[PDB]
Amino acid sequence: PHSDWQIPDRYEIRHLHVCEAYDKLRVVAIKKILRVFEDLIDCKRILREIAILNRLNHDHVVKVLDIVIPKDVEKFDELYVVLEIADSDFKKLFRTPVYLTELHIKTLLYNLLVGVKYVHSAGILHRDLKPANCLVNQDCSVKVCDFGLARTVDYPENGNSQLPVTRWYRAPELILLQENYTEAIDVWSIGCIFAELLNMIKENVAYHADRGPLFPTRGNRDQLNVIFNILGTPSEEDIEALEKEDAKRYIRIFPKREGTDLAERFPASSADAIHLLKRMLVFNPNKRITINECLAHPFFKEVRIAEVETNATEKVRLPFNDWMNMDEPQLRYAFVKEIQRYHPEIQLPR
């Protein structure tokens, strides 16, 4: 009735594709997803996003509270997903004219890691961690979201191989599309987020508008180039540990160069913080610090509570092959199945 929010009365819209609302039955966020089926790759990814969230269950991962019954299961092209609301996210936090302590940073970095540990324990690589999908509350609790590019245990390790958007947080192996990805890719991304967290200290960056990401075909080359300008080019040894011969010849074309010392980029931060960051940002995913070593690192001694560092009871198994070219009928059916988890009386499309 004269609204973009074709959702029950039960929810009273308030703020602002996403709105704040009140549930008679707590405050909540409601996301409206337009043009669901126009592009079948974006569609598949929206489906992956919802299906993974629906199956994850942890304090440090955002919760789907409801998916609203479509007016017509056969024809809908829109969706309403009701979500646990958070005060903000890292990206917006960084844009904010405030400064953080090393305790805050440490706390936010720890809660992120804890949530990513759970995710990995459910056999998922997030594969796309970034400030916008690190949700954050005033009490420094952190919730991961946006699993649309994530890789479940069933995703082929060589990649699907299909015949032929910010990249600032992508590990070199991912930029290089090497596949055979490990936990290491998410560790890299967290390292990149760590650099922005450290820039929240007055003595590292003076004015908030100067804050930015550490590493800002053509797009991939400048991204690798910027990574090399700061950390240096890799060892012959480390080039050799790349999976694919073609990538090796390509990385050997970039002129050999020394790295800068990252400590001199964050001179107000403690040695523990820098040591950790240096260990997250290493080129060879084999030598990169693991998540569990991260949680055990002395930087978190004051904030650690090992009991919240829980694992999944089992791996997430999606009822479809999301690495495959799903057509629209398969996508509509799968969506409705997801919607049946909240409204099981809903008819399936015929």
mmCIF file of N, CA, C and O in Angstrom, residues 66-67 69 336-348:
data_model
loop_
_atom_site.group_PDB
_atom_site.id
_atom_site.type_symbol
_atom_site.label_atom_id
_atom_site.label_comp_id
_atom_site.label_asym_id
_atom_site.label_seq_id
_atom_site.Cartn_x
_atom_site.Cartn_y
_atom_site.Cartn_z
ATOM 1 N N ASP A 66 14.513 -13.700 8.820
ATOM 2 C CA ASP A 66 13.291 -13.939 8.035
ATOM 3 C C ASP A 66 13.547 -13.630 6.559
ATOM 4 O O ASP A 66 14.370 -12.778 6.223
ATOM 5 N N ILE A 67 12.864 -14.363 5.684
ATOM 6 C CA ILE A 67 12.766 -14.014 4.275
ATOM 7 C C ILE A 67 11.300 -14.000 3.941
ATOM 8 O O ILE A 67 10.593 -14.972 4.213
ATOM 9 N N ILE A 69 7.633 -13.991 2.228
ATOM 10 C CA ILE A 69 6.888 -14.705 1.188
ATOM 11 C C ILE A 69 6.658 -13.776 -0.029
ATOM 12 O O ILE A 69 5.997 -12.745 0.095
ATOM 13 N N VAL A 336 13.077 -20.494 -3.189
ATOM 14 C CA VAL A 336 11.828 -20.776 -2.477
ATOM 15 C C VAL A 336 12.093 -21.774 -1.366
ATOM 16 O O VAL A 336 11.553 -21.665 -0.275
ATOM 17 N N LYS A 337 12.959 -22.738 -1.652
ATOM 18 C CA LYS A 337 13.414 -23.681 -0.633
ATOM 19 C C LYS A 337 14.011 -22.936 0.559
ATOM 20 O O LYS A 337 13.749 -23.277 1.700
ATOM 21 N N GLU A 338 14.819 -21.922 0.285
ATOM 22 C CA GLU A 338 15.401 -21.110 1.354
ATOM 23 C C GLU A 338 14.284 -20.394 2.135
ATOM 24 O O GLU A 338 14.316 -20.345 3.364
ATOM 25 N N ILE A 339 13.281 -19.906 1.411
ATOM 26 C CA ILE A 339 12.190 -19.163 2.010
ATOM 27 C C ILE A 339 11.342 -20.094 2.846
ATOM 28 O O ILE A 339 10.834 -19.678 3.894
ATOM 29 N N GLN A 340 11.232 -21.357 2.419
ATOM 30 C CA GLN A 340 10.532 -22.388 3.214
ATOM 31 C C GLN A 340 11.095 -22.634 4.624
ATOM 32 O O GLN A 340 10.392 -23.179 5.472
ATOM 33 N N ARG A 341 12.352 -22.262 4.864
ATOM 34 C CA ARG A 341 12.969 -22.392 6.188
ATOM 35 C C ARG A 341 12.326 -21.438 7.189
ATOM 36 O O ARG A 341 12.368 -21.676 8.388
ATOM 37 N N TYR A 342 11.702 -20.375 6.687
ATOM 38 C CA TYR A 342 10.999 -19.406 7.533
ATOM 39 C C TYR A 342 9.503 -19.465 7.363
ATOM 40 O O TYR A 342 8.751 -19.101 8.276
ATOM 41 N N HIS A 343 9.056 -19.897 6.191
ATOM 42 C CA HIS A 343 7.620 -19.998 5.891
ATOM 43 C C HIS A 343 7.393 -21.291 5.134
ATOM 44 O O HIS A 343 7.255 -21.291 3.910
ATOM 45 N N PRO A 344 7.365 -22.407 5.872
ATOM 46 C CA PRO A 344 7.345 -23.735 5.266
ATOM 47 C C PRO A 344 6.056 -24.082 4.521
ATOM 48 O O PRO A 344 6.038 -25.035 3.739
ATOM 49 N N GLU A 345 4.997 -23.310 4.754
ATOM 50 C CA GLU A 345 3.726 -23.475 4.030
ATOM 51 C C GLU A 345 3.777 -22.956 2.603
ATOM 52 O O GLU A 345 2.817 -23.111 1.853
ATOM 53 N N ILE A 346 4.877 -22.300 2.243
ATOM 54 C CA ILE A 346 4.973 -21.637 0.961
ATOM 55 C C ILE A 346 4.974 -22.694 -0.136
ATOM 56 O O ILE A 346 5.646 -23.712 -0.026
ATOM 57 N N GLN A 347 4.187 -22.454 -1.175
ATOM 58 C CA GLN A 347 4.140 -23.347 -2.322
ATOM 59 C C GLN A 347 5.435 -23.236 -3.120
ATOM 60 O O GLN A 347 5.969 -22.144 -3.276
ATOM 61 N N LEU A 348 5.920 -24.368 -3.627
ATOM 62 C CA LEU A 348 7.039 -24.379 -4.577
ATOM 63 C C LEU A 348 6.521 -24.069 -5.971
ATOM 64 O O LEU A 348 5.358 -24.314 -6.262
#
